[PDB]
Design a protein around this ligand. Structure first.
Ligand SMILES: OC[C@H]1O[C@H](OC[C@H]2O[C@H](O)[C@@H](O)[C@@H](O[C@H]3O[C@H](CO)[C@@H](O)[C@H](O)[C@@H]3O[C@H]3O[C@H](CO)[C@@H](O)[C@H](O)[C@@H]3O)[C@@H]2O)[C@@H](O)[C@@H](O)[C@@H]1O
Ligand SMILES: [Ca+2]
Ligand SMILES: [Ca+2]
Ligand SMILES: [Cl-]
Ligand code: NA
Ligand code: NA
Length: 257
């Protein structure tokens, strides 16, 4: 008469928040030191230790969540962002000539979500809930990572149901571990799969850090129907203000709810 449930309580925890839904993710920004090539290599830091550093500010309602930050080239014709693959020599930017500025200093810009900060050296935390329209397997991916990132899905993994705005939880059970290894870079097209049931809200956390110059995090998901959603997650990601009083908010096992 009923489904048997995923084996060994293996279903990912989801949520049914009852409050006012808002489109998009919240992005919190935290201090990260220029040219610090070690802090971001610790799992504890990328899961929650980032929030022990100074919080710089925040922006809400973000649906286009990929990162593609290019440093300036101060050129003969003005100052323009340089795609990393167009940088050359010591140094110039293709179509611009030689650049007079250093690749090794901090730069200030609104390129990350409109928030004025130093995209060269920062950590950010994206939170919200992913709403699957289809029941099945979802494959999240980072096409590349510069410098360090994680993605976590699920209640008690990304954050607690109905508690999006709380200090980070301590889970290191990342869905995608894109942490910069101690020994030098990771492979591209890093991925993690989650089985999701339609209509339930799945906590989603992305933590991303840049230590110097370029920053890159192209985020995608492959849906059960085999199509891919890249960069702009409008229609899939939502936020809810905390409601720690909502007793029934956590769905430990969506296949038997
Ligand atoms: O062929 C390129 C380069 O090769 C040799 O130089 C190698 C490296 O020398 C140093 O360690 C640094 O200059 C590296 O440059 C990276 O790091 C500095 C910070 O120390 C950045 O200012 C610079 O933009 C560059 O950053 C890249 O790597 C970072 C760490 O992985 C990323 O965070 C960043 O986004 C970017 O990808 C040099 O690469 C020499 O032969 C030299 O002549 C050549 O130009
Ligand atoms: Ca819990
Ligand atoms: Ca970088
Ligand atoms: Cl050129
Ligand atoms: Na880029
Ligand atoms: Na610029």
């Amino acid at each position: 008469l009923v489904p048997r449930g995923s084996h060994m309580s293996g279903a990912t925890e989801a949520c049914l928040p009852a409050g006012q839904r808002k489109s998009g993710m919240n992005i919190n920004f935290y201090q990260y030191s220029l040219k610090d090539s070690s802090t971001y290599s610790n799992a504890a830091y990328m899961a929650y230790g980032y929030a022990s550093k100074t919080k710089l500010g925040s922006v809400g309602g973000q649906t286009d969540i990929s990162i593609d930050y290019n440093i300036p080239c101060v050129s003969s014709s003005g100052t323009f962002p340089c795609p990393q693959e167009d940088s050359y020599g010591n140094w110039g930017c293709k179509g611009m000539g030689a650049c007079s500025n250093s690749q090794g200093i901090a730069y200030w810009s609104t390129d990350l979500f409109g928030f004025y900060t130093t995209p060269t050296n920062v950590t950010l935390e994206m939170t919200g809930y992913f709403l699957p329209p289809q029941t099945g397997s979802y494959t999240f991916s980072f096409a590349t990572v510069d410098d360090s990132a994680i993605l976590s899905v699920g209640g008690s993994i990304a954050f607690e149901c109905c508690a999006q705005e709380q200090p980070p939880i301590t889970s290191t059970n990342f869905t995608i571990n894109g942490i910069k290894p101690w020994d030098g870079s990771l492979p591209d097209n890093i991925t993690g799969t989650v089985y999701m049931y339609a209509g339930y809200y799945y906590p989603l956390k992305v933590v991303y850090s840049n230590a110097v110059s370029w920053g890159t995090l192209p985020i995608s998901v492959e849906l059960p129907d085999g199509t891919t959603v890249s960069d702009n997650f409008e229609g899939y990601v939502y936020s809810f203000d905390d409601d720690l009083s909502q007793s029934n908010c956590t769905i430990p096992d969506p296949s038997i709810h």
